[PDB]
């Protein structure tokens, strides 16, 4: 699909058996979601953006489906204001910027 | 052009006759640049990111070139970690997400 940027590029994702709305963010190195439970081991990480850093939990090798496309990758969980799909997963679904 | 996301989508922009490196960010509503000088009067604005909010100076109808594409719009200036090109200008250059 071709997604215009007149509005925020929000899409539905499927993760941990849950359906959520997330923002396709080319400016984000990683994917970070609001508090939720995920399987497996995790390690702490500090990620920074406008306003500073927040501490999140890092889960690796997590299966996610973005707008119909399946992928696997690292997913961070923490106090993010909105669910964000970063480059680590955008690449997997073949997402590109075009102009 | 078509830009993949295996690395940060950094591009060269031209503003105030000077070249700078900026991030094409589909997750950003606005365009915010690191401290610099711009002409005219500015208005206050508070913008929020993953770490919280920051106060910035808002300048309107500013000439700015992005990857050679000319645009004229709102540019925010403040303590941002990196130069960010938001949707307000990505739409002006005809940028879309595709997969
Ligand atoms: C509506 O608000 C915005 O569009 N804000 C813009 C913005 O922060 N966008 N950001 C993404 C911005 C960025 O891409 C910029 C950046 C890039 C590189 C280095 C430093 C900053 C970002 O921070 N990226 C980081 C990042 C992000 C997620 C996971 C990992 C990482 C690591 C980094 O790559 C998404 C966002 C959207 C809404 C709210 C929000 C807040 C309050 C209320 C409602 N919503 C909070 C965060 C901005 C720029 C301040 C205009």
């Amino acid at each position: 699909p071709q997604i215009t940027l007149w509005q925020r590029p929000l899409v539905t994702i499927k993760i941990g058996g849950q359906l959520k709305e997330a923002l396709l963010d080319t400016g984000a190195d990683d994917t970070v979601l609001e508090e939720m439970s995920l399987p497996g081991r995790w390690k702490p990480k500090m990620i920074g953006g406008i306003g500073g850093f927040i501490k999140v939990r890092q889960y690796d090798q997590i299966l996610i489906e973005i707008c119909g496309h399946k992928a696997i990758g690292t997913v961070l969980v923490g106090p993010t204001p909105v669910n964000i799909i970063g480059r680590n997963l955008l690449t997997q679904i073949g997402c590109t910027l075009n102009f």
Side-chain angles (χ1 to χ4, degrees), chain A:
Chain A
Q2 180 172 87
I3 299 171
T4 55
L5 300 166
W6 296 117
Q7 323 301 318
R8 296 185 188 182
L10 296 170
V11 298
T12 296
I13 64 173
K14 194 176 190 302
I15 180 179
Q18 302 178 61
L19 286 181
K20 296 172 171 291
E21 179 179 67
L23 180 69
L24 299 183
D25 200 335
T26 59
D29 285 354
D30 284 275
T31 296
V32 61
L33 304 176
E34 58 197 356
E35 280 304 332
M36 71 176 289
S37 182
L38 283 182
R41 305 174 58 167
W42 59 270
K43 297 178 173 297
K45 185 178 189 185
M46 205 72 86
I47 56 177
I50 293 295
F53 300 72
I54 54 167
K55 185 179 64 176
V56 299
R57 304 199 306 285
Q58 179 185 324
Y59 293 84
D60 295 329
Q61 315 288 70
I62 297 296
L63 169 58
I64 297 189
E65 304 198 8
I66 302 168
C67 199
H69 295 63
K70 289 196 293 297
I72 307 169
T74 293
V75 173
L76 310 179
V77 179
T80 174
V82 61
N83 293 320
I84 296 167
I85 298 303
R87 297 189 296 100
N88 72 306
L89 293 179
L90 293 176
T91 56
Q92 302 302 283
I93 66 178
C95 186
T96 64
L97 284 165
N98 299 80
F99 62 99

